[PDB]
Structures are given as C-alpha cells and as structure tokens.
Nucleic acid binder design. Structure first.
Lengths: 48, 52, 7, 84
RNA sequence: GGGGCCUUAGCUCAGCUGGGAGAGCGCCUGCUUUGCACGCAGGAGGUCAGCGGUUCGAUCCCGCUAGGCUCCACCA
RNA sequence: GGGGCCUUAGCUCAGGGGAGAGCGCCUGCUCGCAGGAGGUCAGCGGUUCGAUCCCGCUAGGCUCCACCA
RNA sequence: UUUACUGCAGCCUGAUAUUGAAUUCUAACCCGCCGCCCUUAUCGGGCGGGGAGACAGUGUCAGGUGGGCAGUUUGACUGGGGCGGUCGCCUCCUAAAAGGUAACGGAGGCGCCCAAAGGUUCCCUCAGAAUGGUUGGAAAUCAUUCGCAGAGUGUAAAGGCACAAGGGAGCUUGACUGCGAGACCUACAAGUCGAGCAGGGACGAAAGUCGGGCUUAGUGAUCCGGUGGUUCCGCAUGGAAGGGCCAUCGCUCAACGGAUAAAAGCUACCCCGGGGAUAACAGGCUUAUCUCCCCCAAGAGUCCACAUCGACGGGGAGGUUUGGCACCUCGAUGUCGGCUCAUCGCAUCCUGGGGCUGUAGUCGGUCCCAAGGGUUGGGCUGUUCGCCCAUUAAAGCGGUACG
RNA sequence: GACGCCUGCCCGGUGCUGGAAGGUUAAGAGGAGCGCUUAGCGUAAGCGAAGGUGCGAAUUGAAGCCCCAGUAAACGGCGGCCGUAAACGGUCCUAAGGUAGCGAAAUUCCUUGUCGGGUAAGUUCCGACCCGCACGAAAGGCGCAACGAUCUGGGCACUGU
C-alpha cells in the first residue's frame, strides 16, 4: 500500500523527485510544487 | 415402516416378549429376520436356546 | 570403538 | 473440499456419516458423472444429490469451512426440485 | 543392607488420619416365575498374620516375632 | 529430557470489536422444523480501550527424536 | 541414492531434405522374401518375380521423458560432533563514575508508518482523588480545588521534553538544487553532525525558522539489465546500433560485507592429510549428586527428647557412583564380565575385650577399642548387580589404569 | 518360493493402460506493424517514395503436462477421542481404517508381564492369557513328513571339563 512514486515536472518533463505515498489514503494523483533545477524556479510537479 | 438413514425405506419388525424374568425386546429387519440388537444380550452358553 | 584388531 | 465435508458445511446433510453413506451408495453426481464420497468440488459445479424420492439440484457458489449458519447458507443455490 | 506398601469371609479387595467390620463372585434357606440355567429377600464365614501395652472401645496407636511385593547403580 | 500441535458445552471438533455446529437434555408442531440449561474459552500476568484470538511462564493430552565411542 | 542442481546417452513426438504423380498409383528408398549368374558360397552384388512404398531408415533442427550414465553442491557458531537454537539493525544492564569491552549472559523491538503525525506562525497545559449532577453505577460527558508531571511524546528501551520536543487552529510543501569550512567513529568499505554561500521559495509585520518527523532501528555492495534526460563519445565520412555521465527501478542476495544465474542425502564397503587445538576408556581438579559422620530439638517410645528412632532445618569427611571441565595421551594409554595370583584401608561380617540398655537367662539393639586370621557350593542370565535353593562363625564394604 | 488351506479392504497420491470435450503448448510456416538509412519536399525542425538492414504481433504448429476412467500376486496404506457390554453408538479425518490366521514372537521398552510344567533353586526353554510401544495375508499368513557341518532347551550313557 506504500509504493515508490516519482514526481516529474509539468513544464520541464524530467523526473526530478522521488517520494512515497499510501495508496489507500491517497488514491488520487498527488500535486506538490517543487524547485526545478533546469527551470531555475519552483514549478508544479506531477506524479508519473 | 422406518425410513433408512441413507434415504430408502426398509420395514423393521420389533419383537416384544413379556415372560416375566425372560422378557426381552428384539428388533429385526423383517426380510432376513436376523437380530439387529437386543435389550438383553445372551450368550451361546448362558440361555443356549434363542441366543440374542 | 577402540577395537584391538591390528593385523 | 471433499463431498461429505461440503454437504456438512452446506447443511444439506447435517451429519457427515449420513452424507458419506449416501454418496457411497451411488446417489450423488457432480457435473453429470457419478462420483464417490471424496470428489473435490469447485465453485461453479452442478450437484445432483439424491434424497429419498427427491431430485434436489443445487449450484456451488463459495467454499468455506465454517460450522455456523451465519456463514453457511451462501454457498448452495437451488435451481430446480423434482419429486420423481 | 538401605527406604516404602500390605497380611481383612473359600477367592478378588474397600474400610479417611480411635467412635465398635463390609461390596462382588462363591455355599445354603424361603418366596416367585406358564417357558429360554435372565428375579428377589434372609443366614453363616474374620483371634482383621501371631503375642502383649495404651486408653472408655485398636485393622488403625505402640513395641516385639513370622511372611509377600517394590525399591537401589553398571558396562563396553 | 529436547523441538512441533492443541487444552473451547456432558462427548467429539471449528472459531482484537466481544464466539458455534452434530450427538446427549428440554420446549409446541403434526422427517423435518423455529427456540432455550450448560462455556473460570485450563490457570497466572503485560500492551493498549477490550483477548479464545497477541505474548513470558505453570500443569495436562498427542507427534518426532534422545545417536557416535 | 533421490521428487538436490546442471547436463549426456536411450526412447517417444513434430518440421525439413532424400521425396515423385493424381485416399489412390509407381519408376525413388527398404526387403535376416523367392528363382538364375558371379560361385566350389545361408557374405555381397547383378538380373527377373513378389511385398511394402513416398511411409520407413538416415542427415539437420526442435520439444517431452530420461540417475540409466556423468560433473558437482549439500554453510558457520557450538564448553566434542549430531540435534535444538542463532546469524543483519536498534535500546538497557552486565561495563569496573571518558570511550570501548566477551559468553549458546539477562530483557525487548525492527525489515514500518504519516500528505500528514512534515515546515512556519499564533494560542493552551497533562493523568488521577473528592464534591455535585437525569438516563452515570467504580468508571461515557461538565465546573472546582490538590496536582513540576504520578500523563503524553505514531510504533520499543534508554536519554530528554510543560522557557515544552506535549495538545489546538491558519497558511503551506524546505519531505530543496549545487554545495559545504570544520568535526565524531575508525582496518577498509561505509555511517553521523555541521556554521555558512548562491538560486528559487513557505510562514511570519519584523527578528527569524525550515535541506522531514524529540533523538537513536525500519535496511544491504558490485556485476547485469529496465526507464527518463544529456552544447559526451561513437572504429573512413554522415547517421545509427551501442557505450559514458546524471536521476531512478529490479534482492527474506534473511547464512543480511552477498562464492554461482542455477545444487539434497547415505557410507556398519570406505580411503588420505592432521588434532589430544576436540569427544569415548583410564588418570587429574571440584563435590552438584553418591556413601558415611555430626549439631539443634519438636516428637514416638505407658511416665521420659537423647535405651532406640528422629520431623523442620543446619555443618562436614571421603574421592568407591552419576555428573561438570577438557589438563595428559589420537606418528595407539586394548576397553566389560569371568579364570589365575594377590596386596592395602577400616566407615568390622564373624571371632576377641567393653559402656548404655525399656539387658530376668538364651537371643538381641546402639556406641567404643581392635585388620591377627577367616570370610561358600550351586540354578537363571555375557552379565557386575539382583532373585532363589542348601549351608556356615560369617558368607563385609571399598582402593590398587572400575588391580 | 516343496506340499495343504487361504491371500481380506482401499485406485486418494505415484507408476502402467486407455480417452482429447477444454486450456498450456517448441522448432518450422506466416507476415501485420514498428525502428535505422535517403531520391526529394522544407526559412527554422522535421516529413519522407523504392530498396537494403533489425525487432518480428495476430493465425497455424505433435508428443508431453492439467484432466477423466480402470489397474494393488503395481509402488503403497489399512487412524484417533468418549461411552457401552470382540461387537455396537456419537464426533474429527482420510482412499479406507487390519479380514482370516498367528501372537511376550529371529517382532514386546515396561519386563525376569501372569499362571502352569521342567529343576532343590530356571533373566534361557515349553503351553496358554492379549496387556500386539511397533504381527499380518505373494517385501506372503498359518501349519507341515522328510531333510540340515543351522540355532535354542531338556534326558540316558560316557568321561581329568
């Protein structure tokens, strides 16, 4: 129920972050905005 | 006219004898007339005739 | 065992 | 599971000895073919257990080994009954 | 030699930690039973292994004599 | 003596949120019914809000070993 | 040896070439089928007839089955080995007031969880006792005091925390990109803390804090592959296949520094190199057991603890039993029971001399002094031991590598 | 493994034999489709016909395996608790729980089981009880005349054992 997930940027497209989430508490796709090293700014990152 | 435990029907004959101290209750299967069981069990030696 | 059976 | 065990837990025959005697006398068929007291059953079979002058045909749904009526009357489903 | 348990009716055995001896089988008596050796009550049998101390009475407690089972270690 | 599995109604057996069958006993109803008596869940003690359910121990019942000089 | 692993013969089954023509036919192919010739010939070949026939056999490829046959594996710790148990990480004690420190020593947990229980800002203080309350009884919920923590701190032990790290709300994702002076532990590999700079933020007016949770466990190298990115290389050139770098995924590799992607057993048919580093026999050290000797005294013993036994406990001697340890021997210390020959110590079986007796005498009981001598013939069992028969004055215990 | 009388129950698993209704099926056929190059269209980055070169999806493709029956003089197995007087009843489990005949045995830990015989004394022997840890019917069961350089008991004769 606790799986490895990655977070790719919506603008850049690269998989910049990894984290973990519980599938039962969070069935939906998470949306955390993080710093993008390529874009030099904080962009929205989406789980892929 | 008792139904058997497997479902079919087989008539049973129950014999009640009231002879004082020689009284007994004996159940037979009414086709071969062998003793299924008796209330008082008797040996071939003790009461040699009519062994139950 | 220690059987003395030397030949 | 076994046939007599399934008849015991499905409450069709309340005693395992009676179910064993009935299945050993050649009365119960699974999927048309005759079978003994120990034929393994699957969910989705068509039992043809024969009582005294009855032709009860049921359908297997689940297989659980619980000796309680709360979890017993949910495995067999009656399809049709024939007196003779 | 060391500890333990018993000797109780013809036989197998209980009897509580001293308050006055019995069960079953076995042997007779009487009743009853239409009949298949299927039932009932009543009698004996014991110095409780033998002797003597205690107390109001001892299989029981105590001492002294005959007996039977257990219980004790190997080893390579 | 050492591992493994159980101790649940009178008997035989299933089974973290408050536990059940067949037989044995009843209850009214003319080959099957719908209900009741009986459970220290073998006992103790810790983790929490509660234990047949998780654990450290005592008695008990099965199974496998206790071999080499 | 096998349902250990990985394979080889053998057998079975498909495709393909021999191999043709429309179930059928025959020139391919096969006849340990028949007549003639080579030919003096049950080999072979040729010629005719007949049978089968594009089947079979053979070559190549493929899948099953296959200890029948091979090559191997089958862990370590261990108060000998086997068996049981354990193997990595975290907390306490042992640990001797720095750190560290072992044992098959004593107690427990972890192979997670939380999009919030994370970050910031702003507020508040817990558990239990009593009184009063209607369904509240010892406890559901509510007011009061006494409450420095007897509460809580996700999970479990220690350390710590109410100047709260403990509870309640608002806004958020710092649960961050490149790093990092300097340090702690110290075989290495690895692990841990870290002021501070830059880029982009979150909260807060600001100071400021934030590179996950009060801290310490919740995890494993390399190789080989998968995914995304890449002003990197890419075998004459241009590309591509592929490789490099960065990020990330695939382990009960749990024997957790992981031998290989892949592995169980028997040998009383056994062999070799070593060990008394390590067991069985006998010596050695201890005496938990074992055999004896005592202390106290309730009591039994008709009165009476001590004629004789002696509860509950207490103190010793001996190395004869069973043990513990593994000091000596594994380039050999022959191990039970009997036969033969004995010797030694009394904790004395008899015989000799005594004390006390609930010793009238005989026979006895207990305790002293005494090893001089003697301490049996059988039935059973390999037996020591033990039971029984018949004696005897008695048929004694032990040590001497259980002589 | 002479001979005499018999050889009971179980096909669940594994072997053997028979059967494809339905799945799993290799090589070989078969080729969809997707990458790499480029004659050329293109301001930029890309698109791209014919060939060549790799990956090859669907569809076919036997034995064998899953499955279904029989077969035990095939491999093999023939159980527990509680009552009631072997036998019957209640319950769990399996494929079913040992039939006949033997039984303290070349099989029995307890154990030198109990009783009797043999002897003055018999952990050995013989004959019965079943209380069979852990007999058992072709890895045969129970008896059996004759036979044995076999094993275990008991007698006569005989002797320096």
């Amino acid at each position: 129920m606790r799986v490895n997930i990655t977070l790719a940027c919506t603008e850049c497209g690269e998989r910049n972050y990894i984290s973990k989430k519980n599938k039962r508490n969070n069935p939906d796709r998470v949306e955390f905005k993080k710093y993008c090293p390529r874009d030099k700014k904080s962009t929205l990152h989406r789980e892929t | 006219k008792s139904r058997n435990e497997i479902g079919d029907e087989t008539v049973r004959k129950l014999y009640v004898e009231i002879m004082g101290r020689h009284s007994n209750i004996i159940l037979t299967d009414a086709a071969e007339n062998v003793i299924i069981d008796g209330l008082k069990h008797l040996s071939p030696s003790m009461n040699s005739y009519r062994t139950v | 065992a220690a059987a003395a059976a030397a030949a | 599971m076994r046939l007599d065990k399934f008849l015991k837990v499905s409450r069709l025959i309340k005693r395992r000895t009676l179910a064993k005697e009935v299945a050993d006398q050649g009365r119960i068929s699974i999927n048309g073919n005759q079978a003994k007291a120990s034929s393994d059953v699957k969910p989705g079979d068509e039992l043809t257990v024969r009582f005294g002058q009855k032709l009860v045909t049921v359908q297997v749904n689940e297989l659980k080994d619980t000796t309680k009526k709360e979890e017993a009357a949910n495995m067999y489903t009656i399809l049709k009954e024939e007196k003779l």
